[PDB]
Design a binder for this molecule. Structure first.
Ligand code: RET
Ligand code: OLA
Ligand code: OLA
Ligand code: OLA
Ligand code: OLA
Ligand code: CL
Length: 268
């Protein structure tokens, strides 16, 4: 369906190129699932005010891990090694699934941030609402644009412009809330959380770069590079970010007197 519309369909891949992609996707699932166990064992040390943030991390890990596992399988299904190269056998591969996943992943990532920020009640709800709508606006317009990567580069770029507008607006909101709510962080995670904003800024920005590969590197190597950028971005935005949110959650929990949090931080 969407497979003819992505640049992966245009090329034949060397055994090294095809195998590198498969290995990236495979490693990615391994990292996400390993992280998943860790987020899972560690959540018993998070006080309940914050425990939902850690659960969100586990949710993202599986959600992202499943999409990667599936991409890896869709990749091996799509091509066969014939006459010295991997050649397209059928229309089973597309990047469209990543976008669909982001529809779920991003709200989860944002919500875990708001929780450690100590937002609650009406503010949490309203902030969450504006953020996810902005995010959905970004993702959907982006999804529409990627559909035109094979045949209409101007069109991919215009949808890209619209997508970026939502992105910038989303960043302004998360940035503003982090900066206005820092003084309330305990432990003192007021310092850590600003690092979390910079990481997001860096990691999230890699997705747009990946989106533009058809525009500047329209060849088989470009395909490899985009999967690589997705990989760096995925580990940075989901896993590394997740480890920080959890750290902040544990630290805030101990500072507020939750004992399992204190014993845990202490036993290390
Ligand atoms: C777990 C997944 C994450 C954190 C994905 C984040 C994705 C983006 C920030 C996507 C951004 C885009 C633009 C701002 C412009 C082009 C289209 C997108 C969707 C790639
Ligand atoms: C689009 C829908 C957005 C709904 C936002 C979900 C809010 C999370 C829980 C916050 C709360 O109500 O305290
Ligand atoms: C390439 C795109 C990167 C764009 C912006 C963010 C990169 C910088 C992050 C540095 C960390 C700053 C800090 O911790 O104070
Ligand atoms: C910060 C997150 C780190 C992400 C992990 C990514 C791991 C891969 C890194 C480097 C390997 C580069 C080697 C590429 C050899 C090219 C072979 C070919 O494509 O033909
Ligand atoms: C070079 C590779 C760097 C990779 C960094 C990866 C994960 C870092 C996240 C760990 C959380 C640190 C908590 C902050 C603290 O200890 O004060
Ligand atoms: Cl609590």
């Amino acid at each position: 369906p969407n497979s003819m519309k992505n640049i992966e369909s245009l090329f034949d891949y060397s055994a090294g190129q095809f195998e590198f992609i498969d290995h990236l996707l495979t490693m990615g699932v391994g990292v996400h699932f390993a992280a998943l166990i860790f987020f899972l064992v560690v959540s018993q040390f998070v006080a309940p005010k914050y425990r939902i943030a850690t659960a969100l991390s586990c949710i993202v890990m599986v959600s992202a891990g499943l999409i990667l596992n599936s991409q890896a399988v869709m990749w091996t299904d799509a091509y066969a090694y014939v006459d010295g190269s991997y050649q397209l056998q059928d229309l089973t591969f597309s990047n469209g699934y990543r976008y669909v996943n982001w529809m779920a992943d991003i709200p989860c990532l944002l919500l875990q941030l708001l929780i450690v920020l100590n937002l609650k009640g009406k503010e949490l709800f309203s902030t969450a609402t504006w953020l996810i709508l902005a995010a959905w606006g970004m993702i959907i317009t982006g999804y529409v644009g990627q559909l035109y990567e094979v045949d209409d580069i101007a069109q991919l770029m215009i949808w890209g412009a619209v997508s970026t507008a939502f992105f910038v607006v989303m960043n302004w909101i998360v940035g503003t809330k982090i900066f206005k709510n820092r003084a309330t962080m305990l432990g003192g995670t007021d310092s850590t959380i600003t690092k979390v904003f910079w990481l997001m800024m860096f990691a999230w920005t890699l997705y747009p770069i990946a989106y533009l590969v058809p525009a500047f590197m329209n060849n088989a190597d470009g395909v490899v590079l985009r999967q690589l950028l997705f990989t760096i971005a995925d580990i940075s935005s989901k896993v590394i970010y997740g480890l920080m949110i959890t750290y902040i959650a544990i630290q805030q929990s101990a500072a507020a007197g939750y004992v399992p949090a204190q014993q845990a931080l202490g036993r290390i």
